[PDB]
């Protein structure tokens, strides 16, 4: 424990409270697709995984099925593929160690057309090979490269413990880009069936970078509780920025909240003349925040109890 | 044309002079390896390409051979593979139009273990498969992802021609990350044989983002002449930053000079306690600037007059 | 009451016997899927419906789950989607009254993208939006149009009491087309996964009209006991044909039986060269008859005494 | 060409002669409202369509303006809305290929609230969402479902060419129901402002079935020349009935003529006690036949010049 890291429940809750109204977050209404859960169950059934891998897989799939809420106006292919790749990613940012060295040569075996060192890796590679079901060419390439980046980032995510982060460096953002896997979902925000890349890609591409900034910086705002205060992840993006800039993690959370603010501002600017484009990501962002809050089984935001400052729905002298 | 986009030869030379003196650029002594050029000629013969693709390949190989200079202290594997991927990437950034719809389905075809839509893409993918010859797993993966990004970025480079950059956006850096291909050479800076990822990856990785910034931004400083003043590229990083921030192109050029300045400062900061790594990338950056100056064929820096540093040993 | 309309249990049982012997109806074996019932239970659980509609939905779900047997060769998506739309349609054909007037402005709110005046209609519209899970584009269009027809027909089903159906007209078939909802189940016999429209639309489309005639007429035949003999529905297709053609109800029943006979024959003719398509609707029709019989909850066929046939009877 | 399909001009003229005298058709007096054509021109100006989609729109609107004659005693809302939907329907029935695959996902996008794949499709969706200007709830639902049927029918219509209407089947009527789009005009025969559904629907709904029969079959009779004799369409309803029953198209024309005869007689029967409705649909039928004759730019019914006997005129 070091004082330049820890943030109290009251302070973290206050940062969340300001962050929500800074972007005017209203919790979106519940979303229930009856097809997603049995479809993903059938998917897990079809895979040639070992036991304790499917047993854990169902446990993680209960979380994964909520990703379909992120794309309410998208076709079934978009939502189900997003849920499937969400399940595959959750199996990694949780259980990447149960495969050992298998992930280190995923990039080599993927380009060489060879079966992977682990079965789950072959499942992931086959999803990368079928990305064209719901995406365009550029989107498929980005999903492949973002999966490569995510696998290698999670492999080397923990290598910088003992405050390896030297000091003056831009490296926390580089590491967070590698570990984020944000671009995969950023491209599914504008699916190729609703918005074909042919016309709409030049419209939504200038907004993609702030979209991925928003995506990455929110598993760093909303999961900062689950991994740093409640856990021990001292290598997450907030802790890296703190270890390199000297600032406390509390200050870094305020910085990141204001960052998501500014990114949202410029997102509204870019997609303003294209109301349906903007509406798609406006649905996506609220569903993202919602799924982060509701999934207490992974992010534990319910345990954050602090003081209130009752507004009494009034302000009288 | 528009006067807002034009930077005179005087101005561009002044920017090059102050850029070189800000980072203390001594023009390095020339690098010669007798093995690189015949090896690359052998490679082009070995490639089952069409004619006029083997011929322009020789024309580009003249430019591509010199990149072994960027990695002096590295094995023949590092320098030769760098030269090979350079010939491939030069061919693409010049003549990606010649392949039609071949490049757009490269990515998926690569992950499915399929033959490519064009033979040149097959050669590129085969380079991606033998990056382990001189790199570790992390480096190989980064090369693969940066190659995918470069192919798609060059394909979608000129889509934004019709003053598409809306206005308030981080997009220019996002596009330059794709078109820049920087991470490949950045990983080649610290080879797996000399500094294996087993002990040195945690040492050099926190310096890759500034190194990629330096690499991306220098072909935007030194190649700004070949593509914007002499040429017509209005969709490069400088033009996009100017098109989105409203600033003049000259302003953004001096901004990027200061950017590479600060990145070099933090590179020296990061790699101070490991002198061998710092020397490796210092060699790389000096040779990179040198290669841009020498290659008047591609960058035309003989037509602009500018200053470097000298220490009363030009007589050597 | 009226003597022209009453059909004795002897008469109705005899008509059922001859109807099943005309089309060679073996009583099908039971179909069990463990997944369908709790899945529909969870579906009802997550609905934003009220109580006394969730409880009524639970009561109807026992009847609704049987529709999965109509598609025994189909994937789970087809079967369960059919079960859910069946649950909604069963809710409506009985308790359409309990939603006031929300059905009258259902179509406008659906096309306008407005949330419905009732939440049950919201669930129904969401099913209309996710028809793509198991159907092509033509099938989805047909399901939407058929749902609109069914809702408006059920809302105007009983507007023609007091023997409104005037004298001489083709109206009964038109109204039974509206209230039949048959096209939704017809397009589910050949789903998009097993027989994509891509190749099979031109093969099974000329067979939908007789299939929908069978579906429409067999509720009228096998529920005529539950709605007219044991009940009071005097505006169903049989009673309308009676009130308009002057023939007795007992006449119209066997007219309809001969009609389904002639439809089944031409269904066999059209689908002869495609044994896969043929077997699918063979299974559908057998299970449809079986569900009508076994659902004594709503059709009460256990009270009449009629005859199928079998030869190897013991089985299991 | 095949002998089973071609009708000689004398034969077709005789068929049309007997058809006209069977239904007692006196060509109605010319109709004109100065408001309509400039209003539709303003509407086409309002549309966000491309050029040559607006250049063709002016050409088709000249055909489409005459539809206001079909509803003389109706308000301007009914007449102008029918004219607008007629213009959209003509545009799609002629140039559905020009929109690519936009129509195939018209229904889903319509119920998901998403914008259409073509601007014209969004214009059509707006008409569907505002059908309540001149109709009741049932009429709006019928128009929406009939438009979905029309779009998918026009898509899949020619998919049954090359003689694949198998052999034994009810399919030609099933396809002509979808391609006909007849219900949209049939409901406008009894508009909601003059005859609200609040009272009159139980009076006129039994007459809708033969009215749609009349619309489909009358167009099939009067357009048979322009599409099968003069043109090339071998997938219209007449050719389909011929290809399934084995009859000649010459035969099927007379079959359909007598069918229209019967439907007209039963229409006169249904609306006998309600003369207000009977006069309205009489107006519609006269105007519909007349408009088929007048619009020689589309149906070319002036070109049927054929020998005929000469009678004598009495009352001397
Ligand atoms: Mg983690
Ligand atoms: Mg991670
Ligand atoms: Mg995290
Ligand atoms: Mg270039
Ligand atoms: Mg480039
Ligand atoms: Mg350049
Ligand atoms: Mg009923
Ligand atoms: Mg009903
Ligand atoms: Mg019934
Ligand atoms: Mg047509
Ligand atoms: Mg036509
Ligand atoms: Mg016609």
Domain CATH code at residue D36: 1.10.600.10
Check: CB of residue C294 under 8 Å from CB of residue C63.
Answer: no
Burial bucket for residue C9 (CB in 10 Å: 0-12, 13-18, 19+): middle
Q: Which positions ≥6 away from A38 have C-beta within 8 Å?
A: C35, C39, C76, C80
Q: Which residues contact C134 (CB under 8 A, 6 or more apart)?
A: C74, C75, C77, C78, C81, C188, C191, C192, C193
DSSP code string of chain D: --TTT---HHHHHHHHHHHHHHTT-PPPPP---TTHHHHHHHHHHHS-PPTTTSHHHHHHHHHHGGGGGG-TTS-HHHHHHHHHHHHHHHHHHHHSGGGTTTGGGHHHHHHHTPPPSSHHHHHHHHHHHTGGGTS-HHHHHHHHHHHHHHHHHHHHSGGGTTT-S-SS-SHHHHHHHHHH-HHHHHHHHS-TTTS-HHHHHHHHGGGHHHHHHHHHHHHHHHSHIIIIISS----SHHHHHHHHH---HHHHHHHHHHHHHHHHHHHHHHTSS-HHHHHHHHHHHHHHHHHHHH-HHHH-TTS-------------
How many CB atoms are located within 10 Å of the residue D281 CB?
21
Q: How far apart are CA A219 and CA A213, in angstroms?
A: 11
Tell me if B303 is assigned to some domain: no
Q: Which residue has the tokens 């446990």?
A: A59
- Token pair in block for residue C74: 């189909």
Residue B315 lies in a domain: no
* Torsion angles phi and psi, residue B71, rounded to 5: -130, 75
- Number of residue pairs across A and B with CB atoms under 8 Å? 152
| CA angle centred on A55, ends A54 and A60, rounded to 5° | 85
The Cα–Cα gap between A145 and A133 comes to: 17
Chains that touch A (3 or more CB pairs under 8 A): B, C, D
- Phi/psi for D61 (5° steps) reads -65, -25
Ligand lying nearest the CA atom of residue A222: 3
In a domain, residue D86? The reply is yes
CB pairs under 8 A between C and D: 150
**Burial class of residue B98 (count of CB atoms within 10 Å of its CB; 0-12, 13-18, 19+):** middle
Q: What is the dihedral of CA A148, A153, A159, A160, to 10 degrees?
A: 150
Tell me the backbone φ, ψ of residue C108, rounded to 5 degrees: -60, -45
Chains with 3+ CB–CB pairs under 8 A to C are: A, D
Residue of chain D whose alpha carbon sits nearest to that of C210: D170
The residue to which tokens 């109301």 are assigned: A275
Cα angle at A280 between A276 and A285, to 5 degrees?
145
CA atoms of C256 and C267, how far apart (whole Å): 16
Residue C303 included in any domain: no
Burial environment of residue C2 by CB neighbours within 10 A (0 to 12, 13 to 18, 19 or more): exposed
Q: Give the Cβ contact number of residue D8 at 10 Å.
A: 11
Q: Where are the alpha helices (DSSP H) in chain B?
A: 9-22, 36-46, 55-64, 76-95, 106-111, 119-129, 137-155, 171-180, 182-189, 197-204, 208-221, 224, 237-245, 249-270, 275-294
d(C-alpha A245, C-alpha A169), whole Å: 8
Instruction: Please give the structure tokens belonging to residue B98.
Output: 């010649």
| Cα Rg of chain D (Å, integer) | 20
Distance CA A102, CA C85 (A): 46
CA–CA separation, B23 vs B308, rounded Å? 10
Question: What are the percentages of helix, strand and coil residues in chain C, rounded to 5?
Answer: 65, 0, 35
Distances (CA, A) of D310 to C23, D16, D91, D307, D313: 57, 17, 41, 10, 10
Q: Are A109 and B88 in contact (CB under 8 A)?
A: no
Q: How many Å from the N-terminal Cα to the C-terminal Cα in chain A?
A: 44
Taking the alpha carbons at both ends of chain C, their separation in whole angstroms is 45
Largest CA-CA distance found in chain A, in angstroms, rounded: 73
CA distance D178 to D216: 10
Find the closest chain D residue to A275 by CA distance: D115
Strand-pairing partners, residue B26, are B309
B108 vs A125: CB contact, 8 Å cut-off? no
As given in the structure block, the two tokens for residue A11 are 């302070």
Mind telling me how many Å the CA of A192 is from chain D's nearest CA? Answer: 12
- CA atoms of C74 and C279, how far apart (whole Å): 12
Query: Domain tally for chain C?
Result: 1
Whether C216 and C177 have beta carbons less than 8 Å apart is answered as yes
> Considering Cα of D105, then D109, then D110, then D114, what sign does the dihedral take?
negative
Token pair 């984020």 in the structure block, residue: A180
Distance CA C129, CA C263 (A): 32
Residue A273 lies in a domain: yes
**What is the C-alpha separation between D75 and D135, in angstroms, rounded?**
12
Strand, coil or helix: D167: coil
- Cα(A183) to centroid of ligand 4, in Å? 24
**A276/D115 touch (CB, cutoff 8 Å), yes or no:** yes
- Measure Cα distances from B151 to B65, B155, D31, D130 in Å: 22, 6, 65, 48
Closest C-alpha among B7, B3, B2 to residue B256: B7
- Which helix (DSSP H) or strand (DSSP E) does residue C82 occupy? helix C76-95
Which domain, by its residues, includes D161?
A: 9-299
CB atoms within 10 A of CB C20: 20
Tell me the C-alpha distance between B69 and C29, whole Å.
Answer: 80
- How many C-beta neighbours within 10 Å does residue A51 have? 7
Residue appearing with tokens 């889903």:
D108
Residue of D99, D101, D107, D261 for testing the chain C interface, max C β-carbons within 10 Å = D107
Find, among B195, C112, B141, B57, the residue nearest to A152 by Cα. Answer: B141
Taking the C-alpha atoms of residue D178 and residue C279, their distance in angstroms, rounded to an integer, is 27
Task: Give the residues across from A160 on adjacent strands.
Answer: none
Tokens coding B62: 């003249």
Among C61, C77, C128, pick the best mutation site for testing chain A contact (most A Cβ within 10 A).
Answer: C77
- The sign one gets for the Cα dihedral C167, C171, C175, C180 is positive
Beta-ladder partners of B309: B26
Whether C261 is covered by a domain: the verdict is yes
Angstrom CA distances, B160 to A140, B154, B165, B244, C101, stand at 20, 12, 7, 12, 52
Could you tell me if residue C31 is inside a domain? yes
Other Cβ atoms within 10 Å of A303 Cβ, number: 12
Instruction: Report resolution in angstroms.
Output: 3.8
> What are the backbone dihedrals phi and psi of residue B62, each rounded to the nearest 5 degrees, phi first?
-50, -45
Chain centroid offset of residue A216 CA: 6
- Cβ distance C189 to C71 under 8 Å? yes
H helices of chain A, where?
9-22, 36-46, 54-64, 76-95, 106-111, 119-130, 137-156, 171-180, 182-189, 197-204, 208-216, 224, 237-245, 249-270, 275-294, 296-299
Q: How far is A249 from A228, CA to CA, in rounded Å? A: 10
Residue D73 is given by DSSP the state T
Query: Looking at the domain assignment, is residue D62 inside a domain?
Result: yes
Nearest Cα of chain A lies from the Cα of D104 at a distance, in angstroms, of 12
And the tokens for C135?
Answer: 């159907």
């Amino acid at each position: 424990e070091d004082v330049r890291f820890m943030v109290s429940l009251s302070e973290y809750g206050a940062i969340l409270s300001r962050f929500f109204e800074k972007i005017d977050f209203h919790l979106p209404k519940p979303y229930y697709d009856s097809s997603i859960e049995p479809a993903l169950a059938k998917y897990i059934e079809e895979q040639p995984w070992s036991e304790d891998l499917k047993t854990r897989a169902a446990k993680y799939a209960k979380q994964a099925v909520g990703i379909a809420s992120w794309y309410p106006r998208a076709s079934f292919a978009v939502r189900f593929n997003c849920v499937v790749i969400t399940l595959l990613v959750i199996i990694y940012d949780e259980d990447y160690l149960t495969f050992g060295d298998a992930g280190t040569e995923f990039s080599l075996r993927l380009v060489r057309g060879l079966p992977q060192k682990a079965p789950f890796l072959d499942s992931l590679a086959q999803f990368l090979q079928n990305t064209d079901q719901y995406l365009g060419p550029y989107g498929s390439s980005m999903v492949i490269k973002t999966t490569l980046e995510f696998v290698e980032g999670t492999n080397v995510e923990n290598d910088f413990s003992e405050a390896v982060p030297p000091d003056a460096l831009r490296f926390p953002r580089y590491l967070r880009v590698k570990t984020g896997f944000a671009e995969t979902y950023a491209h599914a925000i504008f699916p190729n069936d609703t918005f074909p890349e042919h016309k709409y890609r030049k419209l939504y591409l200038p907004a993609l970078s702030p979209l991925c900034d928003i995506i990455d910086f929110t598993n760093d705002i909303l999961s900062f509780y689950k991994e740093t205060i409640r856990g021990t992840e001292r290598i997450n993006y907030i802790c890296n920025v703190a270890n390199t800039t000297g600032s406390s993690a509390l200050r870094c959370l305020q910085e990141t909240v204001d960052a998501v603010e500014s990114r949202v501002l410029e997102i509204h600017r870019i997609l303003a003349p294209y109301p349906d484009l903007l509406a798609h990501c406006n649905d996506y962002l609220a569903a993202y925040i919602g799924w982060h809050i509701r999934t207490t089984s992974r992010y534990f935001l319910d345990e954050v109890r602090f003081m209130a400052w009752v507004n009494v729905t009034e302000l009288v002298a």
